[PDB]
Symmetry: none
Subunit: 316 residues, 2 copies
């Protein structure tokens, strides 16, 4: 059985649904389904429409996989955080905010070590921002969302201040995937595979033309990504999907489990994104300590009372 | 001659008295006297006792000044709002009240621009409240009531998110007045001078170590405050005194007069506090339109029939 409860999130609007899944063994769990058509996903309406037709998107498959984890935990009355190792999240910096002097010091004192920055609009401006971050001694993650090009990327990197270069943990999707271009880009900085993941022919590559695999539990087959990481001796970073609090707790839960199991193979995550939306009933139950998402009350991903209080509509 | 009518206000129990003042020219007017011993005022009993013996607190002097304004208007058959420029008030948020999703968004849609928050109880509990205010895009006024410290205050400000910082209109009495400490505090945020007003050696300072002077018509010498604001090119904010509806209307009347006269020198007000108490006959006659206090029926501050219906006891 699959049932849903719709919701809308307002950026500081987006539509998604929470899912309640029930199995034969009498277990039931919860998960989130939050499509990002802007990133290439089928819309919420289309994914659910397709589901009725019998086809399940990989994103829905992940929602089910997550709901199962939640189900087993609620059964044994444990929280997804239990058994896992705490992990720090990076701070996402939006260039639509005037970096007040001393702010970086504000983040660092509270525990933050890394800042993720969207790159692409203005390289000059962005370069100046990276210099400020480097000046504070913090590490950084550059995300080009595959908009750049091999040439522009090279010129950009080579000309960055000597203080910046060492503090760039990695560059996500520098430009559209190309085996040779990515392989050569590695000479300038560690390269991370995020939105270009589906472009890699895993059963054909002779080696991995990247250093990090970004795993988003909401969309990525976790076991397969971990397998690839171990096969090629890479590192992995777990992120949320700018989704619902339920999706966020699920993501952190996965990250903490991986950190406990694989230690140094797991880098800091990027799941602290619930603050990107205006408070809803669920977000109200979440608390943070700097780069850490604290354990919320309840079992599974928590929100026991809130989830139990919802009217769930039969889906499939 | 001065006469009074006692009253109690019950928070959502405070004692105060309305005053009926008569002049040799035959005019008579009304005002409120509502002490806040919790804020340093002498008690109602003590102020009235001192009055009978020949001394008026500045608060009583203000009540008289207000009663005269009311008397003049009742003679002309005009309301205190007439000729003034309407002014927006901030919303006073309580920490003992849980925010509900969409509430702040709702206020913003009705015209509200700012939220006032009392700080001091719990910085964290309060800091999270500021994030929600920021998330709604509203400005905020923080009132520390001079309980902090130069040190305890600096730690706080630098930690506020890049979304919050630019949304802080100003901080009222961040800590006990000190010229140097306050001057340096201005670097972290604009500072408003409220309850520490009397600690400033006016005709002795070389410059003003604050950005805003808060005027409470119930106890501040208005002309004197305006003069200092003009002398140091500051800004002023007019507020009520968590007092009787009579006091509230009087305060808004002053704010509208100042706004019409000094325009941009006057910031949004903080007089919409009648809902802080359980309904009484006077509050029943007040209406609002979002952040605006609407013109109530009558002359002077209004409430003509209500005031005329009370039995007044001779005081002095
Ligand atoms: Mg990315
Ligand atoms: Mg104050």
């Amino acid at each position: 059985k699959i049932s849903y409860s719709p919701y809308t999130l307002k950026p500081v609007a987006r539509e998604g649904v929470l899912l309640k899944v029930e199995w034969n063994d009498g277990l039931y769990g919860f998960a989130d389904l939050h499509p990002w058509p802007e990133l290439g996903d089928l819309s919420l309406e289309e994914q659910l429409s397709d589901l009725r037709m019998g086809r399940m998107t990989t994103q829905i498959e992940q929602s089910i996989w997550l709901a199962r984890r939640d189900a087993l935990l609620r059964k044994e009355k444990k929280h997804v955080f239990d058994g896992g190792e705490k992990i720090k999240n990076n701070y996402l910096l939006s260039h639509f905010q005037d970096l007040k002097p001393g702010f970086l010091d504000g983040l660092k004192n509270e525990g933050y070590n890394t800042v993720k920055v969207k790159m692409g609009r203005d390289l000059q401006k962005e370069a100046d921002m990276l210099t400020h971050i480097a000046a504070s001694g913090m590490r950084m993650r550059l995300d080009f969302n595959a908009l750049g090009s091999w040439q522009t990327f090279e010129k950009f990197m080579v000309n960055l201040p000597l203080t910046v270069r060492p503090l760039i943990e990695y560059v996500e999707d520098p430009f559209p995937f190309d085996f040779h271009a990515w392989g050569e880009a590695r000479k300038l900085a560690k390269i991370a595979l995020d939105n270009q993941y589906d472009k890699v022919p895993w059963g054909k590559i002779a080696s991995a033309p990247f250093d990090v695999i970004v795993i988003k539990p909401a969309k990525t087959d976790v076991d397969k990504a971990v397998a690839q990481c171990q096969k090629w001796n890479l590192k992995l970073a777990v992120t949320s999907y700018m989704d619902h609090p339920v999706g966020v707790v699920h993501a952190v839960g996965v990250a903490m489990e991986l950190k406990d199991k694989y230690g140094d193979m797991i880098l800091e995550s990027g799941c602290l994104t619930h603050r990107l939306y205006q408070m809803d009933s669920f977000a109200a139950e979440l608390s943070t300590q700097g780069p850490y998402l604290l354990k919320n009350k309840g079992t599974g991903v928590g929100f026991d009372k809130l989830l139990e209080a919802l009217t769930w509509y039969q889906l499939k």
